[PDB]
């Protein structure tokens, strides 16, 4: 029936202004309070504004006054949010979302987007540095592949074109010196490997690098 | 403005389990109430406005109670889809405002941690990088203290851990250390141990080994 389109991931450098973007489709959009959120990880959401497309009339907060600024089209049944000034505190997800109650609005929203992804960082797209690990052999084995020094997310890792999909744990990314760098398991018992191959296939298309591994031990 | 305050941040229940959430506001809201849902996988969506009326479309496990201040949410019968992040939200006055959160877990029995140690293969000990890594799969309670005691010495400045979310298969935590260097620091200690102090039995799972060997 409803539903709202957020962009994709976007990012930027601090100091500079970012265009988000909320189109909607299934009702009508020129006659309902659309409103945008922010959420940081360590705390829960806030609210950072609303409008009324029809005559696009906004009410912001005081926090946000001056920092975002909303618009919307009407052919394009698109909502916008447009922030500025940029640091490291606005670096976040956010989401567009309509309020219930058709003309007048209500106390409660209805239907949200997916969010759009905001990141901020002075630097360029690069490439990881994809490493072999080994212990040195059991009954039970772990192995994996680690990535190092690439920016931006995502990175797809896939066990011999993802024959594998068992014991696996491909550990969410962190963060050093403003570069990304995660890590991944494999879990095998002793006599599958070093027996049989066991590779693991990495992609980065931000960089457009694809990057297969086949591990040996010392 | 108006603060919402939600009882807790992260709970435990089973399948079935009846279990409730509870806001609270800072002062009256006349009933003005909302509640939502926010999977990991990004999408969020409504269960509940004005503090228990359904909205088109949600089964009838989910209902509603509000009053005042003390607000609340309940499911008298839980599924697995039901996982995720539940929010409040205040319909009284601007601005709106939410809850802190409350994430959801399943409790099951404690579990030690499958422990494996990598020293830095040769392909980066050449580039001058030198990366121990230390991965603690399969375990319970989130809450892990680890350290490295290199030739028995506490040392942070050069780990850098993650978390995964509760595993979709069996409701397990896993955790990745990875402790960077430079080579000539290196190649200046020998012993290097992952302690991973974890409640499941007193004993530190130690998980040790000697560059000379
Ligand atoms: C910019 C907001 C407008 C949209 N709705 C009609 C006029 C304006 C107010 C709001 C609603 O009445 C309302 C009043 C008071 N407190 C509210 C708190 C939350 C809420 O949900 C969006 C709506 C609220």
């Known amino acids: 029936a409803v539903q709202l389109q957020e962009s994709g991931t976007v990012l930027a450098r601090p100091g500079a202004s970012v265009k988000m973007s909320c189109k909607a489709s299934?009702?009508?959009?020129?006659?309902?309070?659309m409103h945008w959120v922010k959420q940081r990880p360590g705390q829960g959401l806030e609210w950072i504004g609303a409008?009324?497309?029809?005559?696009?009339?906004?009410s912001y907060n005081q926090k946000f006054k001056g920092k975002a600024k909303l618009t919307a089209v009407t052919s394009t049944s698109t909502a916008y949010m447009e922030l500025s000034s940029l640091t490291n505190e606005d670096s976040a997800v956010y989401y567009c979302?309509?309020?219930?109650?058709?003309?007048?609005?209500?106390?409660?929203?209805?239907?949200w987007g997916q969010g759009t992804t905001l990141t901020v960082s002075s630097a360029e797209t690069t490439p990881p540095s994809v490493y072999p690990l080994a212990p040195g052999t059991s009954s039970m084995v772990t192995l994996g592949c680690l990535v190092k020094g690439y920016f931006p997310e995502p990175v797809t890792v896939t066990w011999n074109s993802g024959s594998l999909s068992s014991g696996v744990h491909t550990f969410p990314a962190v963060l050093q010196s403003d570069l990304y760098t995660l890590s991944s398991s494999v879990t095998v018992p002793s006599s599958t490997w070093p027996s049989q191959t066991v590779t693991c296939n990495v992609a980065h298309p931000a960089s457009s690098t694809k990057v297969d591994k086949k591990i040996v031990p010392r | 403005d108006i603060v919402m305050t939600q009882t807790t941040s992260s709970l435990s229940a089973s399948l079935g389990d009846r279990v409730t959430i509870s806001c609270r506001a800072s002062?009256?809201?006349?009933?003005?109430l909302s509640w939502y849902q926010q999977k990991p996988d990004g999408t969020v969506k409504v269960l509940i406005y004005?503090?228990?009326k359904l909205h088109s479309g949600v089964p009838s496990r989910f209902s509603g109670s509000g009053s005042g201040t003390d607000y609340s949410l309940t499911i008298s019968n839980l599924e697995q889809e039901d996982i995720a992040t539940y929010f409040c939200?205040?319909?009284?006055?601007?601005?709106?405002?939410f809850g802190g959160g409350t994430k959801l877990e399943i409790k099951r029995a404690d579990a030690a941690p499958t422990v494996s140690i990598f020293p830095p293969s040769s392909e980066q000990l050449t580039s001058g990088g030198a990366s121990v890594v230390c991965f603690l799969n399969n375990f319970y309670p989130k809450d892990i203290n680890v350290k490295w005691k290199i030739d028995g010495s506490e040392r942070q400045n050069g780990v850098l851990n993650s978390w995964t979310d509760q595993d979709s298969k069996d409701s397990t935590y896993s955790m990745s250390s990875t402790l960077t260097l430079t080579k000539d620091e290196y190649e200046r200690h020998n012993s290097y141990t992952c302690e991973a102090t974890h409640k499941t039995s007193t004993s530190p799972i130690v998980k040790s080994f000697n560059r000379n060997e």
């Open positions: 409008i009324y497309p029809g005559n696009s009339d906004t």
């Open positions: 939200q205040q319909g009284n006055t601007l601005p709106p405002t």
């Open positions: 004005y503090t228990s």
């Open positions: 299934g009702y009508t959009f020129t006659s309902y309070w």
């Open positions: 979302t309509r309020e219930r109650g058709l003309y007048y609005g209500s106390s409660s929203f209805d239907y």
């Open positions: 002062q009256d809201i006349s009933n003005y």
